[PDB]
Structure 1
Amino acid sequence: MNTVPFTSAPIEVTIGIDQYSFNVKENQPFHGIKDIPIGHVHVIHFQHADNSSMRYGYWFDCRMGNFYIQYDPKDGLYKMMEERDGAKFENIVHNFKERQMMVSYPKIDEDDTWYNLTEFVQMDKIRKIVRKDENQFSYVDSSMTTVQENELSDPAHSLNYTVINFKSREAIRPGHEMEDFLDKSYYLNTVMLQGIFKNSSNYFGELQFAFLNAMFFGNYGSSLQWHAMIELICSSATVPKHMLDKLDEILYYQIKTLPEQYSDILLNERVWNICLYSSFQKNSLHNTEKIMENKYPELL
């Protein structure tokens, strides 16, 4: 079990850690979050009580270093930093625990939610989507735009998701125009899976990461990427059976976890209705279809 200590909490902020969130008051005594489960990526995110705009946060993996949070009064935000002095870090964290100045990551034992949402997400892939190689952790916020979004302006601050475009030369083989547009299997399996992602686990990891950024930061371009990666699978007549089964589990826990009051903006009516009811895979997503119908029958 690992710890992300906080130097202090100068400004009133709602802090999230994965799917949990708590409030800290201005200058409240507070020195971080303990008992964070090893073995998964994690995200620690912030929304200032004075600016409900700009949710922001940091993806990290405690196996990759000792990380702490410190408020910057010049840039006005809670910054993740790495401590290279192992002994100095243990001592800080030991003191703060003894003083009982840390909230505990509140995982229930029966609960596999976070595992299920991050199963294929790997910190090394996040850092290729979010390029800032001097840090072991990755910053994301509500306003960051995607590479594809940019093509339609600052590159250093972009989400480098794999560009999917169903009306592109990459997606359409010359001479197979109609075939490839109505059956995206060759774009999915040859171009994306074999070509770019190398395997389905990396594909699913980008899909899961896009959803999580959409959910936690309201990052619109991530939402577009998540829907696009769902639609590419659903619009393919030929998909490995192991992928369909795993997609159904992936989407089930995403739909399960989505805040009810955000379904209107986070869920694209057209994509979901097409995927669950018109696409080749309309009958391959039984758990996802069952939860969507019982929880958001309005959308459909």
Structure 2
Amino acid sequence: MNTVPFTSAPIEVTIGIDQYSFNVKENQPFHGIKDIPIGHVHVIHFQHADNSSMRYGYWFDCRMGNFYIQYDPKDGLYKMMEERDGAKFENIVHNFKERQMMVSYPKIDEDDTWYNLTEFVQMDKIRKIVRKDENQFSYVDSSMTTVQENELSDPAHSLNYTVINFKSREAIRPGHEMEDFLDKSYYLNTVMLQGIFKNSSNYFGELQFAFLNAMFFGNYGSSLQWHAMIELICSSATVPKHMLDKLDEILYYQIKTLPEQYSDILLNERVWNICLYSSFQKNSLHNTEKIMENKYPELL
């Protein structure tokens, strides 16, 4: 169980850690988050009280270094940093724990939610989507655009998700125009799985990461990417059975966790109605279709 200490909390802010969040008042004696479960990536995220605009945060894995948060009054945000002096870090954390100035990661023992949302997500792959190689952690915020979004403007600050485009030469083999457009199995299995992602685990990891950035930061290009990756599977007549079963579990837990009051902006009516009721896989997502019908029957 690892710790992310905070130097201080000089501005009032709602701090999230994975699916949890808490309010910190201006100059309250808050010095971080302890008992963070080892074995998963995590995200620590921020919404200032004054400017609910710009949610931002950091993806990190405590196995990869000792990380802390420190407010920068010039750039006006809480920054993640790595501490290379390991004894200095342990000494800081031990003192803050002794003075009980840290909140505890509040995981219920039965609760597998975070594992289920991050099962295939790996820091190494996050760091290729979010390019900033001098840091072991990755910054994301509400405004960052995706590479595909930029083709339709600062390249360094982009989300380099895999470009999916159903009306593209990559998607459509010469001579198979109708076949490949109506049944995307070629594009899913050969171009994307065999060619680009190498296996279904990396595909799922990018799909899960896209969802999480959509949910936690309201990142619109991430939401587009999540729905595109869902639609590509559902619109393929030929998908390995293990992938369909896993997708149903993945989406089930995403829909379960989504705040009910954000469903109007975060769920695309067309993709979901197509996937659940018209696509090749309309009968292959039993858990997802049941939670969608009981939680968001309006959308459908």
Question: With structure 1 as the length reference, what TM-score do the two structures score?
Answer: 1.00
Match of 1:291 in 2: 291
Shift of the alpha carbon at 1:93?
0.1
In 1, Cα distance between equivalents of 2:209 and 2:229: 11
Question: Any idea what SS the aligned residue of 1:288 has?
Answer: helix
Task: Quote the sequence identity (%).
Answer: 100
Q: Kindly tell me the number of residue pairs found equivalent between the two proteins.
A: 300
In 1, Cα distance between equivalents of 2:53 and 2:255: 24
CA deviation profile, 1:256-291 (whole Å, cap 9, x unmatched) = 000000000100000000000000000000000000
In 1, Cα distance between equivalents of 2:151 and 2:92: 46
CA deviation profile, 1:197-254 (whole Å, cap 9, x unmatched) = 0000000000000000000000000000000000000000000000000000000000
Counterparts in 2 of 1:31-110, with a 5 A limit? 31-110=31-110
Match of 1:170 in 2: 170
Shift of the alpha carbon at 1:150?
0.3
Shift of the alpha carbon at 1:15?
0.1
CA deviation profile, 1:84-133 (whole Å, cap 9, x unmatched) = 00000000000000000000000000000000000000000000000000
Counterparts in 2 of 1:222-237, with a 5 A limit? 222-237=222-237
Unaligned runs of 5+ in 2: none
Unaligned runs of 5+ in 1: none
- 2:18 aligned with 1:24, yes or no? no
Shift of the alpha carbon at 1:191?
0.1
What is the root-mean-square deviation of aligned Cα atoms in Å? Answer: 0.2
In 1, Cα distance between equivalents of 2:55 and 2:195: 34
Shift of the alpha carbon at 1:155?
0.2
Match of 2:280 in 1: 280
Question: Any idea what SS the aligned residue of 2:120 has?
Answer: coil
Match of 1:204 in 2: 204
Question: With structure 2 as the length reference, what TM-score do the two structures score?
Answer: 1.00
Shift of the alpha carbon at 1:9?
0.2
Question: Any idea what SS the aligned residue of 1:140 has?
Answer: strand
In 1, Cα distance between equivalents of 2:142 and 2:157: 12
Question: Any idea what SS the aligned residue of 1:132 has?
Answer: coil
Question: Any idea what SS the aligned residue of 1:78 has?
Answer: strand
Shift of the alpha carbon at 1:79?
0.1
Shift of the alpha carbon at 1:182?
0.2
In 2, Cα distance between equivalents of 1:282 and 1:134: 44
In 1, Cα distance between equivalents of 2:293 and 2:37: 33
